[PDB]
Design a binder for this molecule. Structure first.
Ligand code: NA
Ligand code: NA
Lengths: 379, 364
């Protein structure tokens, strides 16, 4: 548990994350829940959330990069880990060494990966084949090439065909694409022997459909308590618990008299108090947040002037003083400080709001009565 | 040096940072250049920049938070360090234990802080000279704050400073505040460090009264604004490149085109709004199409592009269509934020004349 010396931090509720995970376990009781903790678990912290989820029965995680995988491995995570991106061929030995499964996006990739397998790392190379079934980006599109890759894997005892998966492009919105990909997926996967894991659903897909054919699900943002779109949120009645709060303590206040002003980038008409927050755009509270409202001791206050790199200014009631807690992002969907309202202010989606949260912010994890802190600057 | 396992990274040119530093040193020959390495040296990695700058004459550094100062201390930085932000009383002792100078924003703050004192305390007093940016406004209180320092042998009045609000724009405001600053300072004993200029102030004025300067963004090769760029001769060398290699290509039908998939996305700081931008794939300007994803970006490319080819997303030139300022415009923000957005997920590859060194915070 790291120390921190600036009252600006994120509260991460691990009980909320464990509830969300159960919601998914409960919705799909016959499937393996492959917890997606890529991008540092969407800003919350891969390691701490992964440890926590393991203590609650998670046996499989998905990340974006091998760096993310080795990071969980260097911190005691022993569950299975699948890398969703394409590993540079050179690094194949490190995946083998660290027991990390890998995505095969193409035949070419597999062929180049084999060539870089020196014999120093002799454990198995677990492989999940990615299939392209719709808005084709990454993955194998034709069944023939798919059989050929499987056929290649079967020449080497060291390579295991552990999974096959696909990703939906529009599942968080109305349309027949998703169901069209699902059928395309089965049509590809049926023309060859099935591997252990068959997974096609993200958060949207898992909350909206059952997909009996896909024995593993990959919930993401919803683990952290957020709906992947308004459509899904208004569609299903499952309850997800937001897990994040962004907080800052007022460090100083000044009273402007009518006629006096302050220049952070504001002139007062009546007597007004201003509070100085030690948080700014380098923490991920972007400049475009100007004019948004934040919660001070219960009341909505306006963010004035411009947001600076390390400071933010707020028009507040006179009684507010140094030490008062300010909630910039709250843990409730129907809140003027919800991740969604902030995303709207940033003209983006909830994913990016959490992702912008910089390393300069400590993560303070809550589990029942327990409290623990991670401060990257001092790690 | 750390390993890294995704072909996406930042090239941080320390030789460019050292030159920019010498330009300021040369421009203000007899001043201390208090190098601003706050916010992880605007995204470049403060530990490596500070260490590199100490090897080139840097004797004083400025950060935004005590965590930032302590981080430098943990890694061998021995020079002076001033926390520009306001540290509440609680943590003062740790600023004393670690030898970090602090900012006195008010008398309330000082008086109060004279209670977590339980080893010198180096204080730089902050004055509000007209724009409001919180600080002591009146000479009286200014004189009262010093007298208070004089009462404790452990408290040291090391400096006084102010922040100009509009040095990046034209007008007399800066000058008028520069005068107020003098008027206040000349009414009390003068401390060893007197500083009033940021990158802008440093590039545009001489300010002989102020014996120290605080360049920040410009140390890294960026002009604080176009107006400053169009008014000064001084040439700054941009120090950052953002690169990714194409992981796979795919050809589409219905105009038919080839798309390239890059292993970088908004979780790395290449924001969603970058859709519609251009990147440099082997000298070819290619558009970023479709939605930028958390981990991937798709670029419209000529059919001759292939897996493994390098893509420049942010280039180390100002004139370029991938300059930090062009990216800033696309992001409807300022160059400073483009740099701060770059995530911990990106490895920083430092260049120091064919000496390469990597920092991968994930394996660190
Ligand atoms: Na095999
Ligand atoms: Na003294």
């Amino acid at each position: 548990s790291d120390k921190y010396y600036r009252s600006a931090y994120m509260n991460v509720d691990l009980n909320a994350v464990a509830s969300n995970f159960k919601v998914f376990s409960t919705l799909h009781p016959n499937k393996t829940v492959m917890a997606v903790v890529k991008a540092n678990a969407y800003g919350l912290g891969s390691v701490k959330v992964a440890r926590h989820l393991m203590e609650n029965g998670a046996t499989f995680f998905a990340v974006a990069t091998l760096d993310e995988a080795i990071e969980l491995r260097m911190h005691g995570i022993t569950a299975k880990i699948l890398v969703l991106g394409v590993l540079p061929a050179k690094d194949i030995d490190k995946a083998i060494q660290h027991r990390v499964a890998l995505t095969v996006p193409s035949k070419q990739w597999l062929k180049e990966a084999i060539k870089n397998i020196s014999g120093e790392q002799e454990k198995k190379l677990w492989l999940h084949i990615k299939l392209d079934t719709g808005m084709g980006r990454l993955g194998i599109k034709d069944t023939k090439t798919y059989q050929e890759v499987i056929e290649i894997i079967q020449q080497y005892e060291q390579l295991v065909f552990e999974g096959v998966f696909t990703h939906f492009a529009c599942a968080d919105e109305p349309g027949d694409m998703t169901t069209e990909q699902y059928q395309r997926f089965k049509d590809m996967v049926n023309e060859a022997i099935k591997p252990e894991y068959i997974h096609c659903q993200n958060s949207a897909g898992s909350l909206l459909m059952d997909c009996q054919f896909c024995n593993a699900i990959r919930p993401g943002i919803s683990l952290y308590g957020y709906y992947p779109s308004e459509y899904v949120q208004q569609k299903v009645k499952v309850h997800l618990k937001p897990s994040v709060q962004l907080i800052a303590n007022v460090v100083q206040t000044k009273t402007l008299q009518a006629g006096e002003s302050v220049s952070y980038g504001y002139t007062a008409t009546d007597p007004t108090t201003i509070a100085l927050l030690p948080i700014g755009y380098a923490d991920g509270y972007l400049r475009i947040m100007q004019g948004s409202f934040v919660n001070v001791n219960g009341h909505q206050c306006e963010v004035i002037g411009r947001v600076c790199m390390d400071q933010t200014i707020v028009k507040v009631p006179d009684q507010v003083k140094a030490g008062d807690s300010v909630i910039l992002i709250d843990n409730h969907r129907e809140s003027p400080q919800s991740v969604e309202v902030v995303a709207e202010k940033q003209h983006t989606i909830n994913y990016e709001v959490l992702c912008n949260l910089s390393r300069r912010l400590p993560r303070i994890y809550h589990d029942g009565d327990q409290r623990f802190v991670t401060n990257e600057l001092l790690k």
